[PDB]
Amino acid sequence: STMIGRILLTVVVIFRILIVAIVGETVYDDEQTMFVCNTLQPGCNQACYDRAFPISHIRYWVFQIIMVCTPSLCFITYSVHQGISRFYIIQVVFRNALEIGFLVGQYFLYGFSVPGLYECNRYPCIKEVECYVSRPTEKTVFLVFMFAVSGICVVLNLAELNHLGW
Amino acid sequence: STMIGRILLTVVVIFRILIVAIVGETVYDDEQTMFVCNTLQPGCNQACYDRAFPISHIRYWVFQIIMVCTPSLCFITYSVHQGISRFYIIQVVFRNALEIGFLVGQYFLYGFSVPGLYECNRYPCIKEVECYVSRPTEKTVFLVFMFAVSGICVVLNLAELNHLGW
Amino acid sequence: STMIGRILLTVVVIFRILIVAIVGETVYDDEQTMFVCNTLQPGCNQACYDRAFPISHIRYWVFQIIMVCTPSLCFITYSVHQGISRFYIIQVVFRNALEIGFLVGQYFLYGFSVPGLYECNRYPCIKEVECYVSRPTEKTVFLVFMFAVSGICVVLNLAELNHLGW
Amino acid sequence: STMIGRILLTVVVIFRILIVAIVGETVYDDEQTMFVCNTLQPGCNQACYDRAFPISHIRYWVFQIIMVCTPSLCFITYSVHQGISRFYIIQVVFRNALEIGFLVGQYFLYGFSVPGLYECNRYPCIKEVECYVSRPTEKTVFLVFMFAVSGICVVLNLAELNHLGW
Amino acid sequence: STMIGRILLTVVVIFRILIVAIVGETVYDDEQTMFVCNTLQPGCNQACYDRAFPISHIRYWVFQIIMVCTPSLCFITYSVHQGISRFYIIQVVFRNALEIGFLVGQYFLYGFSVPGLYECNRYPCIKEVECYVSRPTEKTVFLVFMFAVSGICVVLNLAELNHLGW
Amino acid sequence: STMIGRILLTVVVIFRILIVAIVGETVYDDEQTMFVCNTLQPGCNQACYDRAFPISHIRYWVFQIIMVCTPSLCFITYSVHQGISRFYIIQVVFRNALEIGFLVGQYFLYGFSVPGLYECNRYPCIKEVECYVSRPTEKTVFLVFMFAVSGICVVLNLAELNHLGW
């Protein structure tokens, strides 16, 4: 239980990268054209959208992917340009911290589901108008899947840390 | 009947990859713009679409493709990083299981055909609205073709397992 | 006149692949947006289109291209993985059969021309409405050209089979 | 005056390919959306377009590019699969013939200019309606440029044939 | 504190390039179609847009990326083409200057935030009409992030210059 | 003052290539959809556009880029073959001439600025209607920038010719 962990980790990482690059880019293509509210005011759709989804999902996840691999890049570089184990320790620690932080943030911003009805009260929208949504179920599914994958990665990293460190 | 099976399987897999990649990305490009219902309510088209096609076909099939090849990647990385036959056995088993599960799921979610009329009763739609569809026949054909290919793969894997199994 | 056959065959195949990949993807980009009928019913354009063109030409031709090269791939594989002439014979036979079948199917489904007026009576369309097509002449030209190329390939394969046959 | 010809010819060929590929694909992107006629009939815009520009320019020129290089491909493959002088001679002849034919056809189909007003009398269009055009001047310029390049190629090939002929 | 600076600089640069290339090309895809003002005049939307955002952030940042790497390219060239430390020093100086200038310009043109309401009085707009922006929050976040990264690069370059200077 | 010139020239050339191929293609994507005039006639927008911008900027500059590098290609070719300096002289001369001609043409066709209003009197437009423009402030910057770069290249080529010439 000290060798296969690395295989599983690398494999889930590549799995995640592939699923994020092949699919997500087009699910969120019609998020603003088919987001329609019930009113005549010019300026309510944009505001209610910006307030519902401030930071889209897929960009959060791209940022996650990138900022989760920087320690490996730093290791690659410091190895090409040349005490050593110390590096491994610190990079493992930072990896764990980043994973945990991003998972908690994912829970706090978006949640576990995506409904089909929002209610906005922003200006210029007159009191409490209703606004609809597109493709909610696919987005729910994608949310849950990525949550699970990130949890698996957390577990593996923690087991490795416990096995290695004091 | 113990050698040509591998060739047939590999060729079928690549055939499937190529078809899915080249063709089935533009058939499903106008699935929401040309999905039109008979009503004036703002919010019926989106809901009736989401309820008709929750998870599109092509994303199901991309996920299938990826999650069916992971054991080969695990084998690859374990052979690059270095009891052995045991690995072959377990990955064969997992391959068979995944393939069967995905085929059964494909039957249970979508079915064998795609009609040209859907009656929806979701909110905000008034009682039993009617809604139309785009390019049903191509989608039927694509369904049937992929079903057949997956069945062939199932048969080949079963024959291999039997030839090798106790 | 016993060797140049290979030259002509390979060159024709590559010619066909190039013409299909460079050109025939934007001609059929506006096939449903500029297909307009004369009526107010919601749901007549989609039905009359699906009935006129159930399977766009270009996907038929992509399928034709792929499913005609599979014997060469199987040969490549069985060679990398290792009585032999027998393989050549069977794959030649299968190539000829596939080519003939696809040509006949191409004649039976579509035809030799593409008119500029269709008449549909499908539901919901009330009796016998008129519908207009886009870019008919280019499609006619492309039909004829591909028919000719496939015929040339048929002739070459037949001559080879005769030269080799008993 | 027997070596620089090859340089000039290859250079103009690559120049032409580059220009075509880089530029032409987007000038002709809005040829049907901004082609507007003065009438209310459904079906006049499509017909008057099809009759004005049956075969677009850029596809003619792609076909021209391809069908002019086939002899070189044949020569390459035959030199890989193994007289040489006879082959060189026949392929030169075919190159000259193809170039001349395509130039004459280019003159006969399109012409030297592209006006900004067309007049169609086709069904369903009631008698002699007027139809407008988009980006005429760029298309005129592109026409003239390609005409000149092809003429240069003709001249070079003919000078070579003379220098070599009997 | 004289070695790890290199790895941090390189990694920050690559991280910035990756972010700018993967994400910030579709956020600014619908900046003019969903920019809507409250008036009937033809010509107010275009003018109020041009006056609000004369130079989109992403063009500025692409220019920044390119014009900051030119000294390294000049070094590469002058090396392939062949006193030397002098070159290193002058290019360090130019790098620092360019970075500082671009940061200050970024502060002066755009600012620290992007609001959701603009008020324009340009011709032809009659007397101070109101106009609504799209996706303000993502753009604010992007602004802040790039500001921070550029500041980090500034600090590292300053420390390097001091470690080496007189 | 006889070595660094080559470096500066190559560097500005690649700089120009990149700035033209990375961004300049999307600024001019909405040049005809958001070009709107004040009238009801069908056929005034197309005519007034064609008369305002006959030959767009970016295509002029692509043509410039290509037709400025042909002498280097001819040199590459004639050098792959195996009196020689003569080639260098003539190619330098042609480079200088082409650059100067393209700069002067750029001044004569477009100018130094791009305004926000154009009055057109072409048929069918009735008696000097007014027409508006999109993004009239990025295009000015792009104009000025390319003008400056071309001027730098002119100066460097002139200095080289003088240093080398009689």
How would you characterize the overall build of this protein?
This is part of a larger assembly, with 6 copies of chain A (166 residues). Chain A has one domain (1-166). The first copy, chain A, contains 7 helices and 2 strands. Chain A has helices spanning 4-22, 24-27, 44-52, 57-67, 70-80, 85-109, 136-164, and strands spanning 117-120, 129-132. In chain A, α6 runs antiparallel to α7. Chain A is elongated. Chain A starts with a helix and ends with a helix. Chains in contact: A-B, A-E, B-C, C-D, D-F, E-F. Chains A, B, C, D, E, F: It comes from Homo sapiens (Human).
The protein's oligomeric status is: part of a larger assembly
State the helix count of chain A: 7
How much of the sequence lies in strands of chain A comes to: under 5%
User: How many strand units of chain A?
Assistant: 2
Rg of chain A, rounded, reads 20 Å
Q: List the secondary-structure elements of chain A in sequence, H or E.
A: HHHHHHEEH
For the sheet with most strands of chain A, the description reads: 2 strands, antiparallel
Number of domains of chain A: 1
How much helix, percentage-wise, in residues of chain A? 55-70%
Distance between the termini of chain A: 18 Å
Instruction: Output the strand order for the largest sheet of chain A.
Output: 1-2
The rough form of chain A would be described as: elongated
- Pair with the most extensive interface? A-E, 21 and 28 residues
| Alpha-beta classification of chain A | mainly alpha
